[PDB]
UniProtKB/TrEMBL annotation, chain A:
Assigned keywords, A-Z: Ribonucleoprotein, Ribosomal protein
Protein name stated in the entry: Large ribosomal subunit protein uL13
Any one of the GO BP annotations: translation
Subunit structure as annotated in this protein's UniProt entry: Part of the 50S ribosomal subunit.
Organism: Cutibacterium acnes
Automatic annotation (TrEMBL), chain B:
Family membership noted in the UniProt record: Belongs to the bacterial ribosomal protein bL32 family.
Organism name: Cutibacterium acnes
InterPro entries linked: Ribosomal_bL32, Ribosomal_bL32_bact, Ribosomal_zn-bd
Gene Ontology CC annotations of this record: large ribosomal subunit
Entry annotated with the keyword Ribosomal protein: yes
Record's protein name: Large ribosomal subunit protein bL32
A GO MF label: structural constituent of ribosome
A Gene Ontology biological process term: translation
Residues engaged in binding Zn(2+): 29, 34, 44, 47
Swiss-Prot/TrEMBL keywords: Metal-binding, Ribonucleoprotein, Ribosomal protein, Zinc
Record-linked Pfam families: Ribosomal_L32p (PF01783)
Metal-binding keyword on record: yes
PANTHER family: 50S RIBOSOMAL PROTEIN L32, LARGE RIBOSOMAL SUBUNIT PROTEIN BL32
From TrEMBL, chain C:
Keyword RNA-binding part of the UniProt annotation: yes
Protein name in the entry: Large ribosomal subunit protein bL20
Organism of origin: Cutibacterium acnes
Lineage: Bacteria, Bacillati, Actinomycetota, Actinomycetes, Propionibacteriales
The UniProt record lists the keyword RNA-binding: yes
Domain of life: Bacteria
Automatic annotation (TrEMBL), chain D:
Keywords assigned by UniProt, alphabetized: Ribonucleoprotein, Ribosomal protein, RNA-binding, rRNA-binding
One cellular component term from this protein's GO annotations in UniProt: ribonucleoprotein complex
GO terms (BP aspect): translation
GO molecular function: rRNA binding; structural constituent of ribosome
Lineage: Bacteria, Bacillati, Actinomycetota, Actinomycetes, Propionibacteriales
Family note: Belongs to the universal ribosomal protein uL4 family.
UniProt protein name: Large ribosomal subunit protein uL4
Subunit structure: Part of the 50S ribosomal subunit.
Gene name in the database record: rplD
Residues of the full protein shown: 52 to 212 of 301
RNA sequence: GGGCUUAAGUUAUCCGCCGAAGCUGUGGCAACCUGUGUGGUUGGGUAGGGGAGCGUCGUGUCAGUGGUGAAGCUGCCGGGUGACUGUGUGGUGGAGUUGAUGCGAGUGAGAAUGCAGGCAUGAGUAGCGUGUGACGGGUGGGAAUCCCGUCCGCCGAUUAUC
RNA sequence: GUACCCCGGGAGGGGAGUGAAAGAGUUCCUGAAACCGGUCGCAUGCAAGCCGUCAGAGCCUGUGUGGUGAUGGCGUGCCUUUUGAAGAAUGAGCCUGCGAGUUAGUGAUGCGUGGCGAGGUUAACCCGUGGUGGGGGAGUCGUAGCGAAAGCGAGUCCGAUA
């Protein structure tokens, strides 16, 4: 019988990513991987084994090309003529948490568990966060060679 | 119009459970010699009386 | 020789309604609906018995990847290194090690590293 | 054994309702076979089951049935089973050449062995036959055959080489 | 078979526990309309239940009340329990015989009318059994 | 789809990996052919052809069996490759019926806007068929709806009488 | 065929009696399913569901097997009829019962099997009042074919004894 985690068996850690000059896609892939515990040998798709990810400097996220103006985010209220459009630059300046959360949510399985795990992603546009009681540890986005 | 399909047991019971009443509340007669339950702001069936303990009046000869 | 159908007929109905003994609504009460659902259940279970191999292999591969990336090695390089080293431990036991005996898994990671082409 | 077809059931002459417009299935009669009280489709009708078995086959089968228990030494020949009037007790005692169980008494004619026939009639473990009515079923059914002398004479004279 | 304790209503409703019960069978009222009142009456103290049912506007309050009273009376005769220390431990309504009738509609049509009945069962126990 | 040019884009090349019920491994089953002590090949399937069986009822025979409890129904614990099933074990039930081998079928139902019965859904929903009743007392377990009385209203070429 | 007592206007019930059995109480043998409920265990009020299947925590139970099942993957009913249907093509509200390849020919034509064999077999009918057994060979198929036929015949016909 293959190992399966039991409820609260796997401990969930707190991490803080400094999103200064980090591309939005890189940050979102890394955050989605951390939130779902994909870096752990005790991974299970049905049990939340992921960690808490705090992202600071979310207003300084890097965008390449003309994305800050030409890359659009859409919302619809459901009633006719109820479409709103904004750009990712204006989202990052105005509501960086919403921008980062949209980018991360697009990168997770469309689940009930994923909706629960996205609540662990705390996003702040400034360099400071209020979660010093949880002692988030720094996380560096890095690649493994070959 | 006419129902398109048979309603499921879950939905039928969901709607049907709301067809219900409430229990009548009842209050004790203020008359010491009656002490029987009656409706609030209603004359007592057992003694036909109404009012507080001090100033009682007879509403029904029953 | 007039025969009555009930004694022979109720046997399959009892069987099917026993197989449908957790289903929701008409599927657990009526023989025809339960029969349709048991047809679907048989198709689903035959398909999932074959897909179980791939599902469990995917889970093992993910766990092996996670445990070998903590040692600075990707899964593809780890598997190629174990193939070149001659250690034929399959992904089921590799994942069991990666969860239960992480030191043995890390030693296997070192074995795989030493057996890479390095080119 | 007989049943009634849809034409033999009482009534059912007229169409129950109109072909179109009623919202009901099309019916032509009330005695159609899918109706409660309607006709039976392929139910039994009177028939005879007698088969035209070749004579040689019947004779050979009776021969083999007799031989099976001639080689088993279960065939006995007696002169008679009773003296005088008709007792069942006396020939019941006499048929104890074997156990009184599935015995067949082969006597001659309906008159030459009237006394023997009436004696063995009530034993209920004895099937009594005339020699001219020997058949395979009664021989394969029997555990012993007890011929009377004249019964064996009649059987051997009737059929032989 | 050749086993003891043939099944009985008391063994299934009480089972050697003190208390009693009553059944009103073939009450010419629908089971749902009786249940609308039985749900109110279940679990209550028996005297409170009968006094409340004296004031309940529903038509099913008069049958059910009688049943409760009968149950109480039974408990006062086979068990020696008093009426004021009894509570309605169980209460349920089952369906009885439903008569078929015809109501003539327009255009030569006849619609079906179902006259439903109900069996009302009430089981009363001493108040000390409420938590035990 | 998220997101991607800091390619996760195109392109050439090299090194790995993932990926099916394919192939290999291991453990069962089955059809045909073949030397007849290796085994080989094969086993998706509608119309359709061929082969072999499960269950129901009646029945010859044999062996039985049943109030120390048959049938039927209903649980639990098992069994077979399938129809299915136990000679396991209860409950209910109250008079039949089991196994072997043959014999005969009114022998198997999910559907025909199929037939009969019973019961759901809509739903405590629509309707309760032109309208004027009110009060006092009585009867009664129970009264808006019964009886009596008093007010009031209604028909009156008819809500009258024959 | 339920005396008598209790609640009730009654209906109904509860005690009690008769009975082997009354949960055999006249709606009376057995008493299935749909359907209707009471009780207990688990789950369920952030969730998109052909309602299952595989993976799977937790709880209850543990009669160490069973109930439920958060959560993850996969997953568009059944039948008919179609090139193609989850189909917004047909039919089906549900359950129980019933409802469609049969029977007759000394029919036609095959096959399996048994008997007899250059032969096989009887029909009506007769005897057995005792039946499923015996007789009955009239007929019928095989025994030689070819030709319109006369006819000839291992040949015959078209043909000229080709
Ligand atoms: Mg709804
Ligand atoms: Mg595979
Ligand atoms: Mg006719
Ligand atoms: Mg006609
Ligand atoms: Mg008839
Ligand atoms: Mg009319
Ligand atoms: Mg294969
Ligand atoms: Mg095949
Ligand atoms: Mg076919
Ligand atoms: Mg015996
Ligand atoms: Mg039988
Ligand atoms: Mg048999
Ligand atoms: Mg049939
Ligand atoms: Mg059916
Ligand atoms: Mg039907
Ligand atoms: Mg209803
Ligand atoms: Mg309402
Ligand atoms: Mg409505
Ligand atoms: Mg309304
Ligand atoms: Mg209304
Ligand atoms: Mg008046
Ligand atoms: Mg006037
Ligand atoms: Mg008596
Ligand atoms: Mg019983
Ligand atoms: Mg009955
Ligand atoms: Mg929730
Ligand atoms: Mg979706
Ligand atoms: Mg076709
Ligand atoms: Mg077409
Ligand atoms: Mg449709
Ligand atoms: Mg549809
Ligand atoms: Mg059509
Ligand atoms: Mg329809
Ligand atoms: Zn009072």
């Amino acid at each position: 019988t293959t190992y399966s985690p039991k409820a609260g068996e796997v401990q969930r850690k707190w991490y803080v990513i400094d999103a200064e000059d980090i591309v939005l896609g890189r940050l979102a892939t890394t955050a989605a991987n951390l939130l779902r515990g994909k870096h752990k040998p005790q991974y299970a798709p049905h049990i939340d084994t992921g960690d808490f990810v705090v992202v600071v400097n979310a207003s300084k996220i890097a965008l390449t090309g003309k994305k800050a103006t030409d890359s659009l985010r859409y919302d619809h209220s459901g009633r006719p003529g109820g479409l709103r459009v904004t750009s990712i630059g204006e989202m990052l300046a105005k509501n960086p948490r919403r921008a980062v959360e949209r980018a991360v949510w697009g990168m997770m399985p469309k689940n009930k568990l994923s909706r629960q795990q996205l609540k662990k992603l705390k996003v702040y546009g400034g360099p400071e966060h209020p979660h010093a009681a949880q002692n988030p540890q720094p996380y560096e986005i890095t690649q493994i060679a070959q | 119009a006419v129902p398109k399909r048979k309603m499921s047991r879950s939905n039928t019971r969901h709607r049907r459970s709301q067809w219900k009443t409430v229990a009548t509340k009842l209050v004790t007669c203020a008359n010491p010699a009656c002490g029987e339950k009656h409706l609030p702001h209603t004359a007592c069936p057992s003694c036909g009386g109404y009012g507080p303990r001090g100033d009682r009046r007879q509403v029904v000869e029953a | 020789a007039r025969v009555k159908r009930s004694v022979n007929a109720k046997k399959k109905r009892r069987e099917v309604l026993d197989q449908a003994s957790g289903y929701r609504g008409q599927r657990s009460r009526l023989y025809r609906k339960a029969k349709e659902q048991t047809l679907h259940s048989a198709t689903y279970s035959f398909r999932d018995r074959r897909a179980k191999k791939g599902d469990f292999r995917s889970l093992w591969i993910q766990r092996i990847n996670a445990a070998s990336r903590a040692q600075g090695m990707t899964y593809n390089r780890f598997i190629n290194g174990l193939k070149n080293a001659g250690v034929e431990v399959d992904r089921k036991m590799l994942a069991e090690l990666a969860v239960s005996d992480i030191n043995a898994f890390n030693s296997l990671v070192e074995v795989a590293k030493a057996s890479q082409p390095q080119n | 054994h007989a049943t009634k077809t849809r034409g033999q059931v009482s009534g059912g002459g007229k169409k129950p309702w109109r072909q179109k417009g009623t919202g009901r299935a099309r019916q032509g009669s009330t005695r159609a076979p899918q109706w409660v009280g309607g006709g039976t489709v392929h139910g039994p009708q009177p028939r005879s089951y007698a088969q035209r078995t070749p004579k040689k086959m019947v004779g050979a089968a009776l021969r083999g049935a007799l031989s099976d228990m001639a080689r088993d030494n279960r065939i006995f020949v007696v002169t008679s089973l009773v003296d005088g009037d008709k007792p069942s007790t006396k020939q019941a005692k006499a048929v104890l050449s074997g156990l009184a169980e599935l015995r067949k008494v082969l006597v001659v004619l309906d008159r030459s062995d009237e006394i023997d026939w009436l004696s063995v009639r009530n034993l209920s473990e004895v099937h009594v036959l005339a020699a001219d009515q020997l058949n395979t079923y009664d021989v394969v059914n029997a555990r012993t055959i007890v011929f009377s002398q004249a019964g064996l004479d009649a059987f051997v004279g009737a059929r032989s080489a | 078979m050749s086993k003891t304790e043939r099944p009985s209503r008391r063994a299934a409703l009480l089972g050697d526990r003190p208390g009693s019960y009553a059944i009103a069978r073939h009450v010419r009222m629908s089971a749902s309309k009786c249940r609308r009142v039985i749900n109110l009456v279940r679990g209550m103290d028996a005297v409170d239940a009968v006094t409340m049912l004296k004031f309940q506007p529903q038509a099913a309050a008069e049958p059910i009340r009688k049943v409760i009273a009968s149950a109480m009376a039974n408990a006062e005769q086979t068990e020696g329990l008093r009426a004021d220390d009894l509570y309605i431990s169980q209460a349920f309504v089952d369906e009885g015989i439903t008569m078929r009738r015809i109501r003539p509609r327009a255009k030569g049509s006849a619609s079906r009318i179902l006259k439903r009945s109900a069996h009302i069962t009430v089981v009363v126990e001493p108040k000390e059994a409420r938590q035990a």
